[PDB]
C-alpha cells in the first residue's frame, strides 16, 4: 500500500505539451528519469485508445485554463501501461506553461 502522496508527482509542460520539468518521483512509479522526458510531447506516451480523449481535455485546458483529465494510461518505461489522472493548469503571464499534478491510479 503506497501513500496517495507517494503516488502523486508534478510535471510542467510547454504549450506544445513537451515536458520542461518532471518530479523525480516519476522514476519509482513509472520508471522514467525526468531528464529523458524533457523535449518530448505527452502525446508520445498516451495509450492509443486514450489519445483522442486527451486531445479533448487539452482543448478544454486551452479554452478554460484548467482541466481534470479523467482516466488515461501512460506507457511505462519498461513495458506496459500505468493508469493516471491529471489536473492541468495553464500559467499565463502579464500562456507560459502547463502545470500538471499527476496521480497514479493503478497501484
Amino acid at each position: 500500500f503506497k501513500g496517495l502522496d507517494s503516488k502523486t508527482f508534478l510535471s510542467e509542460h510547454s504549450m506544445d505539451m513537451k515536458f520542461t520539468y518532471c518530479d523525480d518521483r516519476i522514476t519509482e512509479l513509472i520508471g522514467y528519469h525526468p531528464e529523458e522526458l524533457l523535449g518530448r510531447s505527452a502525446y508520445e506516451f498516451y495509450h492509443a485508445l486514450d489519445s483522442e480523449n486527451m486531445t479533448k481535455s487539452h482543448q478544454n485546458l486551452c479554452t478554460k485554463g484548467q482541466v481534470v483529465s479523467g482516466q488515461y494510461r501512460m506507457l511505462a518505461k519498461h513495458g506496459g501501461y500505468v493508469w493516471l489522472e491529471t489536473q492541468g493548469t495553464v500559467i499565463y503571464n502579464p500562456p507560459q506553461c502547463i502545470m500538471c499534478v499527476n496521480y497514479v491510479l493503478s497501484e
Binding site: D16, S41, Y43, E44, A48, L49, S51, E52, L75
Partner: protein
C-alpha cells in the same frame, strides 16, 4: 490499384511542417491535425525510437533516400503499416538548415 500515399515535410526533429491533403484518405486526419506535431506522436511505441533514429540519420546521408516501416495510428485509433521514404533537401544557393521531404504509403506487413 493506386497505393494510398501522401507527401509531408518535417523539420529535422520530426515536427510536420507541410502536409499534402491526400493524408485524409491515407490516415484519415486533416492536414492541420498533423501540422506542428511530431510524427513520433502518431507512431506505435515499439516503432518510436526507430523512427527518431531514422530522422537523425536521413540528414547524414547526403540527400539519398532513407526508408522506414512503422505503425501509424489513423484517425480511427487503428495501427496502419506505413512505409515512409525520405530524403533531405537544401537549396545550394543557400546555407539554410536542411529539411526532410517524406512520402508516406500504407503498405502490407506480410
Amino acid at each position: 490499384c493506386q497505393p494510398t500515399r501522401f507527401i509531408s515535410r518535417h523539420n529535422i526533429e520530426g515536427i510536420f511542417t507541410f502536409v499534402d491533403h491526400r493524408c485524409v484518405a491515407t490516415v484519415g486526419y486533416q492536414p492541420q491535425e498533423l501540422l506542428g506535431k511530431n510524427i513520433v506522436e502518431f507512431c506505435h511505441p515499439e516503432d518510436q525510437q526507430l523512427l527518431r533514429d531514422s530522422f537523425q540519420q536521413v540528414v547524414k546521408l547526403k540527400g539519398q533516400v532513407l526508408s522506414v516501416m512503422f505503425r501509424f495510428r489513423s484517425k480511427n485509433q487503428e495501427w496502419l503499416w506505413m512505409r515512409t521514404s525520405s530524403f533531405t533537401f537544401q537549396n545550394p544557393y543557400s546555407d539554410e538548415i536542411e529539411y526532410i521531404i517524406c512520402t508516406n504509403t500504407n503498405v502490407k506487413n506480410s
